Amino acid sequence: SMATRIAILGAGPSGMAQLRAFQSAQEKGAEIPELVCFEKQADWGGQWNYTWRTGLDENGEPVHSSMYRYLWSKGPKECLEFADYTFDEHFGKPIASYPPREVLWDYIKGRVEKAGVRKYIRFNTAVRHVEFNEDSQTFTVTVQDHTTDTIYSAAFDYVVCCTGHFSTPYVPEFEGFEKFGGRILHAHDFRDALEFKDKTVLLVGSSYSAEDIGSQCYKYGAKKLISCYRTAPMGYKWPENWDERPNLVRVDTENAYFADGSSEKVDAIILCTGYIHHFPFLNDDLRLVTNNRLWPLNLYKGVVWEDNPKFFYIGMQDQWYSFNMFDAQAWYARDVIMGRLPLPSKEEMKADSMAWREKELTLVTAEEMYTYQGDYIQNLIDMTDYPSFDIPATNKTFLEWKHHKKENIMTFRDHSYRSLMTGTMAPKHHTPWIDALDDSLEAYLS
Amino acid sequence: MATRIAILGAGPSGMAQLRAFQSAQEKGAEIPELVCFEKQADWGGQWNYTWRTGLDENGEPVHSSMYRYLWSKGPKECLEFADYTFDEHFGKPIASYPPREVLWDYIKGRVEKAGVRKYIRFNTAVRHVEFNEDSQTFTVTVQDHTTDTIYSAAFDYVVCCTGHFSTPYVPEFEGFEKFGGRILHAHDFRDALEFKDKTVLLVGSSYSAEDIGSQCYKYGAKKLISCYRTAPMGYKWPENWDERPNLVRVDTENAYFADGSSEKVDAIILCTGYIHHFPFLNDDLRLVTNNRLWPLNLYKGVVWEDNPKFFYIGMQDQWYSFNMFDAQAWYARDVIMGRLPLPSKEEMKADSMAWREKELTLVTAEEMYTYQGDYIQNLIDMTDYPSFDIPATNKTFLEWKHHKKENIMTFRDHSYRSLMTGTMAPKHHTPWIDALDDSLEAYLSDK
Numbered sequence: 001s002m003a004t005r006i007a008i009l010g011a012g013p014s015g016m017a018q019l020r021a022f023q024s025a026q027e028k029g030a031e032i033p034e035l036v037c038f039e040k041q042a043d044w045g046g047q048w049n050y051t052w053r054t055g056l057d058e059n060g061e062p063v064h065s066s067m068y069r070y071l072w073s074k075g076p077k078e079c080l081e082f083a084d085y086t087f088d089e090h091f092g093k094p095i096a097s098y099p100p101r102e103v104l105w106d107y108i109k110g111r112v113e114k115a116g117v118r119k120y121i122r123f124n125t126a127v128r129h130v131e132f133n134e135d136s137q138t139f140t141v142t143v144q145d146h147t148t149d150t151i152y153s154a155a156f157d158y159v160v161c162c163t164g165h166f167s168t169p170y171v172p173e174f175e176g177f178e179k180f181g182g183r184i185l186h187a188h189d190f191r192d193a194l195e196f197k198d199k200t201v202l203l204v205g206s207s208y209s210a211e212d213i214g215s216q217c218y219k220y221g222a223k224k225l226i227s228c229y230r231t232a233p234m235g236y237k238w239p240e241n242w243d244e245r246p247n248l249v250r251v252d253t254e255n256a257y258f259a260d261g262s263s264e265k266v267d268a269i270i271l272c273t274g275y276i277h278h279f280p281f282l283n284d285d286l287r288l289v290t291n292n293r294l295w296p297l298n299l300y301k302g303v304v305w306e307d308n309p310k311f312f313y314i315g316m317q318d319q320w321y322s323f324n325m326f327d328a329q330a331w332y333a334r335d336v337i338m339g340r341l342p343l344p345s346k347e348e349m350k351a352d353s354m355a356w357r358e359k360e361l362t363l364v365t366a367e368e369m370y371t372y373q374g375d376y377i378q379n380l381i382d383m384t385d386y387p388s389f390d391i392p393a394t395n396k397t398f399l400e401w402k403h404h405k406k407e408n409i410m411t412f413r414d415h416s417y418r419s420l421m422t423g424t425m426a427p428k429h430h431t432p433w434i435d436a437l438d439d440s441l442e443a444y445l446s
Numbered sequence: 447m448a449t450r451i452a453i454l455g456a457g458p459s460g461m462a463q464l465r466a467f468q469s470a471q472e473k474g475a476e477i478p479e480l481v482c483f484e485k486q487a488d489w490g491g492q493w494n495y496t497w498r499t500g501l502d503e504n505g506e507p508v509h510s511s512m513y514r515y516l517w518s519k520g521p522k523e524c525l526e527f528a529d530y531t532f533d534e535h536f537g538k539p540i541a542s543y544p545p546r547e548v549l550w551d552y553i554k555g556r557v558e559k560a561g562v563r564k565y566i567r568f569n570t571a572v573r574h575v576e577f578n579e580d581s582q583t584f585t586v587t588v589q590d591h592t593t594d595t596i597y598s599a600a601f602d603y604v605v606c607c608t609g610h611f612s613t614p615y616v617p618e619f620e621g622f623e624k625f626g627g628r629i630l631h632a633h634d635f636r637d638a639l640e641f642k643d644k645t646v647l648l649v650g651s652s653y654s655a656e657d658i659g660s661q662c663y664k665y666g667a668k669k670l671i672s673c674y675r676t677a678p679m680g681y682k683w684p685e686n687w688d689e690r691p692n693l694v695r696v697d698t699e700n701a702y703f704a705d706g707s708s709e710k711v712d713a714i715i716l717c718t719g720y721i722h723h724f725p726f727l728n729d730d731l732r733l734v735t736n737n738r739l740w741p742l743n744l745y746k747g748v749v750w751e752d753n754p755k756f757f758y759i760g761m762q763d764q765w766y767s768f769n770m771f772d773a774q775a776w777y778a779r780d781v782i783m784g785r786l787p788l789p790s791k792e793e794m795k796a797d798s799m800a801w802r803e804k805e806l807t808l809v810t811a812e813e814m815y816t817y818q819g820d821y822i823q824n825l826i827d828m829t830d831y832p833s834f835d836i837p838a839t840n841k842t843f844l845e846w847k848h849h850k851k852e853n854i855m856t857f858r859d860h861s862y863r864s865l866m867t868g869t870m871a872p873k874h875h876t877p878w879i880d881a882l883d884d885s886l887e888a889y890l891s892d893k
């Protein structure tokens with residue numbers, strides 16, 4: 001109805017938030033651009049759409065989801081609630097604070113099922129190339145539609161990139177991998193923990209993947225777990241059959257050797273070494289290059305590409321906050337696309353981003369980090385009609401979560417926190433984490 | 447010479463393409479400028495083994511489907527280069543079914559001698575090829591992973607040598623989303639010892655199934671089941687390996703089959719083939735076909751009929767391999783160089799149709815490899831590729847077929863005669879089943 005045409009790449013949480021932002025503005029009576037969203041999977045959800053598939057999907061594209069069986073929320077759900085679609089509204093009842101994948105998946109779909117935005121999406125279509133033409137001032141987006149096996153392009157006035165940054169593995173090599181006889185994989189290819197039942201598992205890395213894949217491995221009966229770190233130990237007090245050591249240095253037919261001179265028989269090695277920002281459809285003029293951090297550079301307000309401000313990136317930061325961060329972002333992007341918030345000059349954009357980067361470098365403690373992100377989110381929601389929830393109250397919730405993890409890393413998921421949107425407190429779940437062997441939504445909600 | 451060629455990939459076909467040009471210039475011709483792009487850090491293609499699975503370190507798809515303990519699948523006598531013999535490379539006779547590392551060494555040998563490595567830009571992935579109608583040139587856009595830059599270059603011709611056995615065809619079966627063992631495609635199979643003392647289901651009834659089964663067996667898998675969609679492999683298997691009708695569904699631990707059987711299974715390996723997948727090509731340049739002896743739209747099986755400045759090498763199914771690619775690369779070379787002019791689109795189409803009509807006739811393995819030999823024969827008669835004896839190579843194939851029928855676990859223990867040198871291969875020092883060391887070093891010593 002407005003003259004322009006927008007392309008949204010990806011229908012993960014960020015892609016869905018972006019459609020939702022437009023749908024919301026129009027429901028309040030605005031005229032909005034034409035929307036096309038492209039998604040390579042057959043259904044929306046992004047990471048949350050679980051697949052048994054590993055490696056390359058059935059059309060030959062990279063498998064996107066890194067999620068595995070038995071995965072549950074990693075932080076209080078109370079911290080990732082939508083300000084415009086509460087947990088109360090979706091579920092009709094109170095539920096525990098750390099829901100399984102399927103439940104959280106259900107929740108986010110619910111919002112966009114209600115919004116009726118599914119119709120903007122062309123599923124099973126992979127983005128191949130985006131180019132900007134200087135003379136028309138438009139982007140040409142080329143895609144492959146895998147349902148018809150045709151490749152075609154279309155012209156757009158703005159492009160919002162919502163393709164995530166936790167799907168292309170960073171996989172470093174260690175000496176002797178070419179002759180190790182057990183399995184080597186990246187966290188990205190981890191599926192069923194029962195595959196590692198009665199086995200000795202090495203996890204390389206000291207971040208969330210290593211904490212969590214370790215825990216699932218443990219909880220489903222891995223015989224022994226070794227996890228090893230490059231910089232500093234995770235530092236949690238692990239179960240009896242799990243130990244932390246200095247980094248792996250080499251491997252041979254059955255054995256792993258470590259930097260402290262230890263050595264051990266190992267059955268499988270899981271690289272929990274993170275991901276890279278990888279945009280294979282973008283040229284150097286549009287393509288973001290960064291490591292995982294709270295403040296990537298060259299994004300104004302963390303979302304506008306400074307070299308071509310008709311291009312936007314959603315959710316490319318590291319994530320303490322997640323779902324409502326993407327909303328705050330998508331709402332911003334929407335508003336600038338729609339002319340409601342004009343942009344400053346390239347010089348001020350750069351100055352502003354530099355200030356944000358300066359402060360990022362200041363940050364030492366987990367507490368400072370999520371607060372920094374809250375400060376960021378706060379800035380965004382103040383500029384748009386996103387409902388402004390209570391950021392400091394969400395920070396306390398993060399703080400409590402931090403503590404519970406320290407107390408006992410195996411039972412942090414058994415606690416409860418209060419919604420910052422509704423005020424409702426979460427009930428205890430009906431089963432302790434360690435004993436809830438059934439990841440299904442059906443079991444979680446009975 | 448005025449023009450500029452882009453060669454995509456430095457596997458056996460890419461290397462053959464470089465070698466054809468180098469050869470022509472060694473006999474005194476002026477050749478085009480050459481750029482070859484390879485995404486891996488070394489040449490060899492499938493033969494360059496990687497422990498990596500899924501996506502490689504730059505984020506590109508892992509290319510090699512090869513696994514530890516792999517050896518040649520047919521007589522080496524059948525895949526010898528007519529211009530670089532096994533005798534010349536190795537300085538001695540060797541057995542007929544060499545390991546991966548040994549064949550790898552042999553093909554690199556030819557191009558190390560030719561000095562063509564300097565044309566290649568390694569660690570560079572091809573992203574897009576476009577043809578511009580107004581300049582009549584191709585713009586090839588690539589990412590260099592050493593510098594992390596994306597750039598383009600203009601070319602007059604493009605030869606595509608990126609292979610067709612690297613993007614898995616992976617079908618879904620009911621209940622995969624809840625099975626608790628591993629699911630993988632043959633593409634991701636690396637060490638057989640990962641399946642020691644385990645029960646392994648192999649879905650499929652072709653070469654991957656035969657060979658991944660055999661490796662699994664030979665390295666001590668407890669039990670093997672292999673199931674087929676159309677017809678059984680039909681070989682007489684070991685005692686802990688059986689063939690059944692197709693898998694229908696799966697649950698937490700169990701596999702159920704079409705004949706009503708059911709079994710506890712540890713790992714499922716899909717041995718279901720690959721797809722021709724060219725993610726850098728638009729519909730005007732992109733070949734779409736299933737695995738076969740005669741894909742359609744390739745004139746002489748190499749020239750893209752819709753834009754004859756674009757060429758495809760090694761896109762057929764492979765009885766013959768390495769010297770088929772040479773026959774082709776030499777043909778492509780000669781057309782690109784002006785030595786062989788092309789007919790009209792109409793005759794290209796008519797000729798291709800005739801070849802396809804015959805491909806539909808083929809029933810027996812013997813007819814199939816003979817067809818391919820007829821095809822190869824046609825190509826080498828048009829270029830100065832040395833014409834070896836195709837009928838003699840056909841016999842070798844035929845003997846190989848027999849040995850496989852007699853005993854599927856000892857076909858690799860036989861020996862055949864080179865069709866290039868006449869030399870007969872010696873017996874290997876170790877029976878296949880007992881040769882647990884896949885290394886070049888072990889294969890070439892005398893114990």
Ligand SMILES: Cc1cc2nc3c(=O)[nH]c(=O)nc-3n(C[C@H](O)[C@H](O)[C@H](O)COP(=O)(O)OP(=O)(O)OC[C@H]3O[C@@H](n4cnc5c(N)ncnc54)[C@H](O)[C@@H]3O)c2cc1C
Binds near residue numbers: 045075
């Ligand atoms: C293993 C794991 C566990 C996590 N757990 C939690 C958690 O418990 N809590 C939490 O808050 N966050 C968690 N996260 C963070 C997660 O990043 C966010 O929750 C959320 O998934 C961000 O979604 P997104 O839309 O930005 O990207 P994604 O969820 O990755 O989705 C991006 C979309 O882009 C599509 N796409 C990509 N490339 C193309 C292409 N070339 N063409 C077409 N479409 C394309 C993908 O198919 C996908 O649908 C987890 C992440 C991982 C990897």
Ligand SMILES: Cc1cc2nc3c(=O)[nH]c(=O)nc-3n(C[C@H](O)[C@H](O)[C@H](O)COP(=O)(O)OP(=O)(O)OC[C@H]3O[C@@H](n4cnc5c(N)ncnc54)[C@H](O)[C@@H]3O)c2cc1C
Binds near residue numbers: 491509760
């Ligand atoms: C598991 C397996 C076992 C086999 N065993 C035998 C055997 O024993 N005997 C036999 O005769 N044949 C065998 N083959 C057949 C095999 O196809 C040929 O031997 C030979 O490897 C074909 O070489 P190629 O150059 O055509 O393709 P490939 O060997 O696949 O090489 C193609 C090259 O293209 C490069 N490439 C692809 N995409 C890009 C890109 N986008 N950008 C840059 N570079 C790219 C690749 O990295 C690779 O180097 C086997 C095949 C498989 C899968």
